[PDB]
Structures are given as C-alpha cells and as structure tokens.
Scaffold this active site. Structure first.
Site, PDB file in Angstrom:
ATOM      1  N   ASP A   1       0.690  -1.281   0.121  1.00 25.66           N
ATOM      2  CA  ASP A   1      -0.006  -0.154   0.048  1.00 25.66           C
ATOM      3  C   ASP A   1       0.867   1.305  -0.160  1.00 25.66           C
ATOM      4  O   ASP A   1       1.300   1.582   1.093  1.00 25.66           O
ATOM      5  CB  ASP A   1      -0.955  -0.151   1.124  1.00 25.66           C
ATOM      6  CG  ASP A   1      -2.009   1.109   1.181  1.00 25.66           C
ATOM      7  OD1 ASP A   1      -2.053   1.831   0.293  1.00 25.66           O
ATOM      8  OD2 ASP A   1      -2.472   1.135   2.349  1.00 25.66           O
ATOM      9  N   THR A   2       0.967   1.966  -1.264  1.00 24.62           N
ATOM     10  CA  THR A   2       1.955   3.144  -1.233  1.00 24.62           C
ATOM     11  C   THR A   2       1.081   4.403  -0.599  1.00 24.62           C
ATOM     12  O   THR A   2       1.749   5.335  -0.439  1.00 24.62           O
ATOM     13  CB  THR A   2       2.241   3.503  -2.777  1.00 24.62           C
ATOM     14  OG1 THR A   2       0.962   3.372  -3.404  1.00 24.62           O
ATOM     15  CG2 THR A   2       3.016   2.471  -3.404  1.00 24.62           C
ATOM     16  N   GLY A   3      -0.165   4.080  -0.400  1.00 21.44           N
ATOM     17  CA  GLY A   3      -0.896   5.228   0.215  1.00 21.44           C
ATOM     18  C   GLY A   3      -1.024   5.195   1.836  1.00 21.44           C
ATOM     19  O   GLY A   3      -1.425   6.122   2.313  1.00 21.44           O
TER      20      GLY A   3
END
Ligand SMILES: CC(C)[C@H](NC(=O)[C@H](C)NC(=O)OCc1ccccc1)C(=O)N[C@@H](Cc1ccccc1)[C@@H](O)[C@H](O)[C@H](Cc1ccccc1)NC(=O)[C@@H](NC(=O)[C@H](C)NC(=O)OCc1ccccc1)C(C)C
Ligand SMILES: CC(C)[C@H](NC(=O)[C@H](C)NC(=O)OCc1ccccc1)C(=O)N[C@@H](Cc1ccccc1)[C@@H](O)[C@H](O)[C@H](Cc1ccccc1)NC(=O)[C@@H](NC(=O)[C@H](C)NC(=O)OCc1ccccc1)C(C)C
EC number: 3.4.23.16
Lengths: 99, 99
Positions: free
Chosen positions: B25-27
C-alpha cells in the site's frame, strides 16, 4: 518516472483546467478526490477502508492527467484528507511497483 | 519483481515466523496487520482510514520480511480487514513506483 517512498507519493494531476496534488495509491481500488465540482450525472457508491464503509459520489468517464499522462475513468468524490489516485487509473498510465 | 496494478498487489510476508498475504500500500504511512500475536513492548495508537478510526497496538523494531526481503520497523496490530504494508517498510526493501 521513478518515485521512492521515503515521503508520501504526491504528484501533480490536472482535472478540468485545475492543477491539484494527488497520492499515487496502490492500496486504493478506486480513485477518490476531495470535494469538487464535476460535470454530468453521478450515482451512489459504497466504498470501505480501515474504519468502515462509506457512501460517496461516483462520476464515470472523467478525463484526468497524472504527471503528464492522460487517463479517463471513474472518479469518486467524498470527505478524503487527500486526492487519491487508485488502480483504475494507475493501470491506464502503466504505473507499476518494483523492487 | 515488477507488479502491475490490474488486481490488488497482494504479496507474501513473514512476521513472527508466520507467512501471510498482505497488500503493498503506497498510500499508507504505516503498516497495519490483522489481529495476531507479537513480542516486546506495545502501546495503543489510534489511526485513521477512509471509514473512520480504529485503535491499534503499536510495536516498534519488529523484524518482518516481504517476499523474503528483510525489513525492521514499526508494525500496528488491530481490527484491519486486511494486512497492509506501508511506506515505512516498503522503503526498506527498495520498493518504488514506476511509469
Ligand atoms: C481509498 C479507498 C478507495 C481504499 N479502499 C479500497 O480500495 C477498498 C478495499 N475497496 C472498495 O471500497 O471498493 C468499493 C466497495 C466498498 C465497500 C463495499 C463494496 C464495494 C482505502 O481505504 N485504501 C487504504 C488501504 C486499505 C485497503 C483495504 C482495506 C482497508 C484499507 C489506503 O490505500
Ligand atoms: C492503511 C491506513 C493506515 C491508511 N491510513 C493512513 O494513511 C493514516 C496514518 N493517515 C491518516 O490518518 O491521515 C488523516 C486522517 C485523520 C482522521 C481520519 C482519517 C484520516 C489508509 O486507510 N489510507 C487510505 C487513505 C485515507 C486516509 C484517511 C482517511 C481517508 C483515506 C489509503 O491510502
């Protein structure tokens, strides 16, 4: 380009004739933008995250440009702390994870 | 590897000598995992997501592996729908976004 993750992956995007900042989010199925005016009809949509489900507005076939790459797809509008670019648009600009 | 985003970027992780599926999850600023067991001190922490807030258990300096790639850092354990790998560990395995 190549973006590292030491800090939040915020990039410039343009929607309408407006420049905005948005998060490249591989953990978002859909694209969710902060409240704004969009054209045409919308339909309701239920989405979820940690914390629970929530109903937001769904607009379809919306042109959007991400770091200079044009895409067209669904955009959701709701009470988010940031503009979020999800996988539905990320695939469109050929964005990938690598390591 | 190079992971496309047509589907959720689920990968194999290992923590506490156990393998599991988790989302890249880059967010996510943090790493949050489904209720399990962990060592060392932990202290509460409230965190926010798209549906509201949840209270979790913060564990520091936890060794973890993502696709066999070693990392060590903070990990939160709480009622999350799914295991989420945040930037705090992704930087540690040289994970980057590309397009
Ligand atoms: C921004 C949201 C659209 C994003 N959520 C999603 O992509 C979720 C899994 N998908 C989703 O909400 O699809 C629409 C839906 C929702 C509920 C019921 C039926 C259909 C999210 O909270 N993403 C966070 C990670 C996460 C992922 C899975 C579960 C919980 C938190 C940060 O990346
Ligand atoms: C997996 C979670 C740790 C991740 N949460 C975060 O990134 C946290 C630390 N950020 C965070 O909480 O930012 C502000 C905030 C404040 C109050 C309520 C909600 C949000 C998440 O669900 N992130 C989603 C974005 C998001 C965050 C907050 C609210 C709505 C959507 C997708 O990127």
């Amino acid at each position: 380009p190549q973006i590292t993750l030491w800090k939040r992956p915020l990039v410039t995007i343009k929607i309408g004739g407006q420049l905005k900042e948005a998060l490249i989010d591989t953990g978002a199925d859909d694209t969710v933008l902060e409240e704004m005016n969009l054209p045409g009809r919308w339909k309701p949509k239920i989405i979820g995250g940690i914390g629970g489900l929530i109903k937001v507005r769904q607009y379809d076939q919306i042109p959007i440009e991400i770091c200079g790459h044009k895409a067209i797809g669904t955009v959701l509008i709701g009470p988010t702390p940031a503009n979020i670019i999800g996988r539905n648009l990320l695939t469109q600009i050929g964005c990938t994870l690598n390591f």
